[PDB]
């Protein structure tokens, strides 16, 4: 039922809030965009680099257009959604914006609990539990508050941000249940681990500390139990799609955008690789006119950033019965007819940008500087008493239960700003 | 007549576009704020500070934050104007989130267009064509194209980004005349300087080269005439007003947050200066508990922010025919209850912040980074045959008339990312 996935509905909240009682100009999926622009994590993504360093890169950015790609693609499911179900406008009042917000909103903080250095960040964190100085705490946590930490996940780190209760400010950002919901893209735990090869299993979404919390907002949407077992699993609210496709879209085209205005890429394979995505629609001769190389690059990406959209909202809305229900297996672009057009973008980018050596420095770099920086805060945590450890707290972590203490440790070195985490490690060993 | 003032044209043009025709997932207004958010200079913004170097104060994000502003206020303004003249919904098509974005658009340019260094920028530039190399230029050039360069304004050089035709682009990112209208608070020329102590008049904000392209908004928005000499100046789009409330608001209200997170502002000044503007909405309990410093003062910028949006709104209202008249002399926040608290603000701002030893050594700074750039490229523009020339040549202006080489020059130094004008500073010396 979409007026259930169309919640409202804020954590702690005693009452319902309809549709229809709403002040337009204080909507409250509108105000969850507001809250995360304005939030400290996400202006925290000012000073957050992507893989590429160039200053003119930062995650900021590409949160941004992600969720311009996000506002558009629910904006035009939106408006043939309430063409399908009228209904929804009618009686609920709904209107086709409202998705839109809900879709931007989600998009914005999608990398938001992302640690620095990419998946090498993520990697490296596990890697300290699994086989480093963290292996210690295994047999004192269940196997799936250990598996949050091994396999530690960015995409699970941001919905903790979002939501995290601290003094004075419960419940995080407080946005409404609907964003939430198109924010869960692997709706389940990190137990059992991909238990199939649906596109919803290859990772999870959320940490134990939080389980609470997404059961609250799971049935809350009504989304579709995947799990009738102690390992609780979810089918993706249908927005959750949306999300998903405007963040593949951006890292394939825009990737290669800034492969080539970087140098990685040669401008000469521009052409080739985006000629099917833009073929109808390239004015060639204004193509041939325009001087710089940033000015073609971007006329392209906006060509097929255009076609990949339009093609996805007929994509969502071909298969809206079988997202609806639970059964759609992929993402939407797996079904795109650019498919191997996609993949060869995809495989151009991994070899030319990701296995750059200036990238693969930076993560072999981040490896030491996160391994560094979880030494320090977890022997501080095991022994708070000597002189050095009550420093390092003062340091790193100013003003509960050891997995509580141990998950807020990851996700406060993952959110650390870049010019932070490398500053306090040079401290910490003397630079 | 606000049928006219919500213009839909793009510069070029042929045929009317009518709000009733529109798409409303392709809305022009809404596709404004998605062409700047992609554009060059919009991005460049993540490489460039404001006053203070702290890597996590951007211009981009204060110009988010203005946008997020400008359309609150815009909806809010939008829906009330819509209660006032029925007609424009029932019988034109419009609709109040238009207002909003047709004000944050306009808001989230507002910025694009100013150099580096702040004022300091602006006032290096214009120094030089006084005083400097450029006083040789004052004799081939009209008295309106010679202020343009010993008054350079930020303000102007927006409306030329904005709107700069190029080979393979003409009419830079074409954005609907009802937000070029809203974008221009100094509807004037360079000349005459300050006519009277109207805000309208305190600065200008069209160089010459962009007068044609002011003139085709000028009449289709309907704007009225306030010179009828070959000296043009026009009573400003009602939405600039609220475009600069936005920005009024947050430069006070946020550099205030930046300077005590930074520092520079003792904390125990926060609630007093404040207290007036968050009084009856503070939960003081909440205040109390919440542990960071950075925590208290968002919380409390978000109360003085919605305070002074609310009261814009109501101003905004009550002078909304002197406004539709040309007749209102002043801004929405000149008329606030909170002007004293504010001149409270802006000054303490002005001494911890403005006045602080790093923000005057930068400033310093930035006069010979600013002044060097426009010596080397004017020196190159003059003797565009020997060897050293022609490196200056491809090194800052790779791939027309005195005064377009001239404007020319000043926009591209004026739209360099910090990083890159330091760069190229430090090579023309040699560092
Ligand atoms: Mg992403
Ligand atoms: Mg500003």
Redesign the interface.
Known sequence: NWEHLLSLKRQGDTAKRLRIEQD??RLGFEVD??RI??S?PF??L??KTQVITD????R??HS??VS?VGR?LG??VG?KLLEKYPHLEQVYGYK??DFGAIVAAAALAHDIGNPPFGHSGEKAIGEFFKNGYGKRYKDSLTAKEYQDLIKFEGNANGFKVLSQS????QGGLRLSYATLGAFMKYPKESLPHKPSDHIADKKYGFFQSERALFEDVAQELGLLKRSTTDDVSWSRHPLAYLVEAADDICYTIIDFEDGINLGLIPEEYALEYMVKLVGQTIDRN???????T??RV??LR?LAIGTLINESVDTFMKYEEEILAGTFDQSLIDKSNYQAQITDIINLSIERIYNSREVIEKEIAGYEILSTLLEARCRALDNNDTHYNQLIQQLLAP?KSLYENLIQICAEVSTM?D?KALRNYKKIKGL
Request: glycine share 4%.
């Open positions: 337009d100009t965009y507001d622009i304005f400290a202006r925290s000012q000073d200053f003119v890169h930062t900021l950015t941004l257009e311009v558009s904006r035009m408006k086709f914006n601290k003094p004075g400010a204004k193509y041939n006119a325009l001087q710089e940033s000015d971007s006329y906006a003003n700003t010019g």
